[PDB]
Design an enzyme around this catalytic site. Structure first.
Site, PDB file in Angstrom:
ATOM      1  N   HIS A 123      32.670  46.469  40.726  1.00 58.96           N
ATOM      2  CA  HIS A 123      32.746  47.922  40.572  1.00 58.96           C
ATOM      3  C   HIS A 123      31.762  48.614  39.639  1.00 58.96           C
ATOM      4  O   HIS A 123      31.575  49.827  39.747  1.00 58.96           O
ATOM      5  CB  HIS A 123      34.156  48.337  40.148  1.00 58.96           C
ATOM      6  CG  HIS A 123      35.222  47.939  41.119  1.00 58.96           C
ATOM      7  ND1 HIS A 123      35.181  48.277  42.453  1.00 58.96           N
ATOM      8  CD2 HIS A 123      36.336  47.189  40.956  1.00 58.96           C
ATOM      9  CE1 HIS A 123      36.220  47.743  43.070  1.00 58.96           C
ATOM     10  NE2 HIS A 123      36.936  47.076  42.185  1.00 58.96           N
ATOM     11  N   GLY A 131      36.772  50.045  37.112  1.00 62.23           N
ATOM     12  CA  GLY A 131      37.701  49.031  37.585  1.00 62.23           C
ATOM     13  C   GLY A 131      37.699  47.683  36.886  1.00 62.23           C
ATOM     14  O   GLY A 131      37.773  46.646  37.544  1.00 62.23           O
ATOM     15  N   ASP A 158      37.171  41.089  48.876  1.00 63.52           N
ATOM     16  CA  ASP A 158      38.143  41.509  47.877  1.00 63.52           C
ATOM     17  C   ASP A 158      38.993  42.612  48.479  1.00 63.52           C
ATOM     18  O   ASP A 158      38.520  43.359  49.345  1.00 63.52           O
ATOM     19  CB  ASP A 158      37.393  42.084  46.661  1.00 63.52           C
ATOM     20  CG  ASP A 158      38.209  42.045  45.385  1.00 63.52           C
ATOM     21  OD1 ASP A 158      37.996  41.098  44.600  1.00 63.52           O
ATOM     22  OD2 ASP A 158      39.051  42.941  45.158  1.00 63.52           O
ATOM     23  N   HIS A 160      39.518  45.271  47.302  1.00 67.55           N
ATOM     24  CA  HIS A 160      38.848  46.543  46.999  1.00 67.55           C
ATOM     25  C   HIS A 160      37.442  46.668  47.513  1.00 67.55           C
ATOM     26  O   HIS A 160      36.766  45.675  47.768  1.00 67.55           O
ATOM     27  CB  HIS A 160      38.825  46.817  45.508  1.00 67.55           C
ATOM     28  CG  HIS A 160      40.178  46.833  44.887  1.00 67.55           C
ATOM     29  ND1 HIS A 160      40.829  45.681  44.501  1.00 67.55           N
ATOM     30  CD2 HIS A 160      41.032  47.853  44.631  1.00 67.55           C
ATOM     31  CE1 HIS A 160      42.027  45.988  44.038  1.00 67.55           C
ATOM     32  NE2 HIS A 160      42.177  47.300  44.105  1.00 67.55           N
TER      33      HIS A 160
HETATM   34  C1  LIG Z   1      51.450  48.358  36.019  1.00 66.97           C
HETATM   35  N1  LIG Z   1      50.119  48.665  35.490  1.00 66.97           N
HETATM   36  C2  LIG Z   1      49.997  48.684  34.031  1.00 66.97           C
HETATM   37  C3  LIG Z   1      49.004  48.932  36.374  1.00 66.97           C
HETATM   38  C4  LIG Z   1      49.167  48.896  37.812  1.00 66.97           C
HETATM   39  C5  LIG Z   1      48.058  49.155  38.681  1.00 66.97           C
HETATM   40  C6  LIG Z   1      46.759  49.451  38.144  1.00 66.97           C
HETATM   41  C7  LIG Z   1      45.580  49.729  39.070  1.00 66.97           C
HETATM   42  O1  LIG Z   1      45.751  49.687  40.288  1.00 66.97           O
HETATM   43  N2  LIG Z   1      44.385  50.014  38.530  1.00 66.97           N
HETATM   44  C8  LIG Z   1      43.160  50.312  39.257  1.00 66.97           C
HETATM   45  C9  LIG Z   1      42.086  49.245  39.100  1.00 66.97           C
HETATM   46  C10 LIG Z   1      42.171  48.267  40.262  1.00 66.97           C
HETATM   47  C11 LIG Z   1      41.459  46.968  39.951  1.00 66.97           C
HETATM   48  C12 LIG Z   1      40.034  46.944  40.449  1.00 66.97           C
HETATM   49  C13 LIG Z   1      39.393  45.613  40.100  1.00 66.97           C
HETATM   50  C14 LIG Z   1      39.402  44.715  41.316  1.00 66.97           C
HETATM   51  O2  LIG Z   1      40.440  44.254  41.775  1.00 66.97           O
HETATM   52  N3  LIG Z   1      38.225  44.436  41.847  1.00 66.97           N
HETATM   53  O3  LIG Z   1      38.136  43.696  42.827  1.00 66.97           O
HETATM   54  C15 LIG Z   1      46.591  49.493  36.727  1.00 66.97           C
HETATM   55  C16 LIG Z   1      47.695  49.232  35.858  1.00 66.97           C
HETATM   56  K   LIG Z   2      36.128  44.239  49.796  1.00 66.42           K
HETATM   57 ZN   LIG Z   3      40.211  43.674  43.921  1.00 68.01          ZN
END
Ligand SMILES: CN(C)c1ccc(C(=O)NCCCCCCC(=O)NO)cc1
Ligand SMILES: [K+]
Ligand SMILES: [Zn+2]
Ligand SMILES: [K+]
Length: 357
Positions: A123, A131, A158, A160
């Site tokens: 990201h 992210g 991924d 995402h």
């Molecule tokens: C319960 N809690 C404290 C949370 C729950 C969900 C998130 C989130 O979706 N955040 C958005 C970032 C998503 C991750 C992106 C990185 C990734 O998976 N890249 O591949 C954050 C905190």
């Molecule tokens: K992807």
């Molecule tokens: Zn991801």
């Protein structure tokens, strides 16, 4: 001719310090090792990335700011997602250089597949963190592969959308990015619809496959194999960087897709079969045990082996309950991908690739 494994006690220990995935690095390693898969791989110690290697993508203002913070903060995306954590500059340099190191081996014939499970931070922007990504090792790895390869293909499996890497090469045709992610309004990072294809000299050299919840192994492999086939045709790459976030796998707290390590394996197999160089990266993966299960199983299809179903006793054996097996059973959730939408998507992609030379 033996797969390179980027490992070192100091490294894994460094990665276990990542907030979101505590000890995930050890778990992946110790599970891969408890299967003695590291015996059939060329273990290579990772080198730390230098301030000038990271500067091949990130701005000095960003890098120097990230550094001062490592000891007005929410300037370079260093907010809720990417905190100003003490020592992040050092964590990112270690992970970034771990991919630069793996990339070098590919352009040295020292191997035809290098693995860095602790990488895949897709990201990050050139001057912005996002992210939980402070440095874009995927881009640093691809930019290093550009020293010897003319056409590099980047596949992001991924959950995402690999925006950071897409943005980096959206204006170029020398590197084509493919991303199969969940696309839905209000879901991170909110980009990557099928209509997204790149800009300027890089128009059509960006492929995006928006998916919905519940998708499973076969439905996913068909879509992946289909798109990866048309792509090898038109682009005909020289090297391949594969991002394998395990946050797609069933059981992840993300609860979006419903894959198993085998669905992804079919995709991995299909790509390895091109016998092009290959830089394997991890990424998301928030169910620690399952992530080790997925990447170990995948380190297994990389070595053509077929791992034992009973999880070997080891450092983290207890975290593998209640069944203690390497297989992941899909959740009983409905697939929300109407087959007609997947076709409209596949056609639109198909007609976007004809425009490639
Ligand atoms: C319960 N809690 C404290 C949370 C729950 C969900 C998130 C989130 O979706 N955040 C958005 C970032 C998503 C991750 C992106 C990185 C990734 O998976 N890249 O591949 C954050 C905190
Ligand atoms: K992807
Ligand atoms: Zn991801
Ligand atoms: K591109």
């Amino acid at each position: 001719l033996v797969p390179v494994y980027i490992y070192s006690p100091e490294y894994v220990s460094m990665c276990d310090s990542l907030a979101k995935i505590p000890k995930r690095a050890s778990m992946v390693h110790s599970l891969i090792e408890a299967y003695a898969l590291h015996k059939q791989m060329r273990i290579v110690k990772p080198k730390v990335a230098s301030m000038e290697e990271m500067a091949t993508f990130h701005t000095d203002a960003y890098l120097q700011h990230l550094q001062k913070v490592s000891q007005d903060s929410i300037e370079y995306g260093l907010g809720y997602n990417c905190p100003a954590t003490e020592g992040i500059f050092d964590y990112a340099a270690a992970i970034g250089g771990a991919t630069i190191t793996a990339a070098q081996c590919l352009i040295d014939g020292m191997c035809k597949v290098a693995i860095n499970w602790s990488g895949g931070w897709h990201h990050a922007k050139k001057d912005e963190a996002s992210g939980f990504c402070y440095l874009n090792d995927a881009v640093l790895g691809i930019l290093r592969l550009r020293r010897k390869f003319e056409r590099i293909l980047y596949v992001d499996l991924d959950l995402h959308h690999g925006d950071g890497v897409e943005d980096a090469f959206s204006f170029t045709s020398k590197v084509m990015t493919v991303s199969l992610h969940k696309f839905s309004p209000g879901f991170f990072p909110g980009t990557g619809d099928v209509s997204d294809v790149g800009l300027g000299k890089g128009r059509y050299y960006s492929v995006n496959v928006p998916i919905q919840d519940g998708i499973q192994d076969e439905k996913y492999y068909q879509i992946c194999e289909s798109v990866l086939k048309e792509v090898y045709q038109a682009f005909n790459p020289k090297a391949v960087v594969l991002q394998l976030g395990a946050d797609t796998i069933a059981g992840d707290p993300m609860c979006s897709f419903n894959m198993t390590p085998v669905g992804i394996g079919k995709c991995l197999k299909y790509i390895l079969q091109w016998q092009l160089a290959t830089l394997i990266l991890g990424g998301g993966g928030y169910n620690l045990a399952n992530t080790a299960r997925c990447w170990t199983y995948l380190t297994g299809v990389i070595l053509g082996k077929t791992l034992s179903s009973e999880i070997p006793d080891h450092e983290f054996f207890t975290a593998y309950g209640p069944d203690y097996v390497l297989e992941i059973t899909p959740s009983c959730r409905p697939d929300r991908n109407e087959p007609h939408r997947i076709q409209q998507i596949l056609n639109y992609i198909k007609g976007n690739l004809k425009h490639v030379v």
